[PDB]
Amino acid sequence: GSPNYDKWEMERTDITMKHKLGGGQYGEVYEGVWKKYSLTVAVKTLKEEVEEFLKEAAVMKEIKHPNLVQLLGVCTREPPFYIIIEFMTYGNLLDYLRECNRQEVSAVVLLYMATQISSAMEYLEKKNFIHRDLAARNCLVGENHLVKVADFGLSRLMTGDTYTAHAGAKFPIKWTAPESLAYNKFSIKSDVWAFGVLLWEIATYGMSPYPGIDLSQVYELLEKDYRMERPEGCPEKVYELMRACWQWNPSDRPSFAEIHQAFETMFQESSISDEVEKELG
Ligand SMILES: COc1ccccc1-c1c[nH]c2ncc(-c3cncc(C(=O)N(C)C)c3)cc12
Known part of the structure; x- marks a missing residue:
């Protein structure tokens, strides 16, 4: 050669x-x-x-x-x-959600989006990689609501169960886990926390997280157990998964494997009703 x-x-x-x-x-x-x-x-x-x-x-x-x-x-x-x-022809997910027709991008489509994303993270989790910048702005959209995770600029293959970022380094406060903000410590669990924020972005069709609250006040609030409210229209199961992703102790947060399983299930059941509804008009 x-x-x-x-x-x-x-x-x-x-x-x-x-x-x-x-x-x-x-x-x-x-x-x-x-x-x-x-x-x-x-x-x-x-x-x-x-x-x-x-x-x-x-x-x-x-x-x-x-x-x-x-x-x-x-x-x-x-x-x-x-x-x-x-x-990806339809751009990033955040803008896509902000400009979409909600009768088209319905409850089943939001579940489908979460399912695809959790599928990508389950794969990364299995490979012991961390993304470090999960957010709607960093997810992309293709034809038929295909969604892909992007921007691997901070992604890393870990050797241990935690990665410590450079000193003095700073991150997107609203998507960042408590232990990451306070001790620059990252892990698969910190991505899980970010995924929870991403779910909220999806549920709200792209609203900016922590409405009204000052970035400088976010950590102190989380420390007292404050967490974003269930978005209007978000099913209770989804909000519950969301809150699990925001458990203060990283070890208490579920795995992406578990997260993906939960969404695949909700999506399929939701999908049945969708197909039927579709087949009436
Ligand atoms: C998060 O995506 C990235 C972050 C860092 C490095 C690469 C990407 C990236 C890879 N493939 C892509 N495809 C489309 C867009 C994209 C996103 N938003 C808007 C557009 C756009 O201008 N149109 C017209 C679709 C394109 C962005 C990317």
Whole structure:
């Protein structure tokens, strides 16, 4: 074989760069086209640090799942570096929920979304990886309400049961578990907490978490056992799972395996009524 062959490396000239996607919401991530195959793609690059970029690229080569956005290739031999990923046509979940028709995106669709996401996290959990940035803004939407988890910039394969982030490092307060906020300690359980917040975002069709409350007051409130209220219309079972995800002690939070099982079940039962209803009109 050829000496410098690398299965993941693509020629940067193969890609046409267009414009930043998500309205620049995700930084240097552009919509591009893999000319050879007339395929629209998402390309993350580095402005003119690298270590984190290369780490993100390496992690994406190791994970593969139906509900995890798929790495297509990279350009990391020389700058500018690229990470070429499949493009999800309906954008991110947060904006999708904020602009959707609710008769279309009904209760069964919200359950379907949660099910797909928990499926991706169960896979990651099994592989001992942590995501560290679960949020609706970081989930993507495809045709027929297909949903995939994205943005693996902070994802890590753990060696132990916990990962301690750099010192002085700071995180998205409203999606971050108590022990993460206070001691920079992360784990599969901290992702579970974030998933609970994501569920709330889904249930509210994209509302910003902790309505009214000041970020500076969030931790103190959680410490006294305050937790967001059940959204209008959220089934009790779902709110209960939500509250379990927000148990103060990480060990008390359920596993993604358990979470996925619960949602698959609710989705299927909810789905039956949906199919029937559909078949009346
Ligand atoms: C969270 O997604 C990411 C975070 C970091 C790095 C890559 C991605 C990413 C991979 N494939 C994608 N596909 C579509 C969008 C996307 C999201 N929001 C809006 C758009 C958009 O502009 N339209 C028109 C769909 C696209 C974002 C990504």
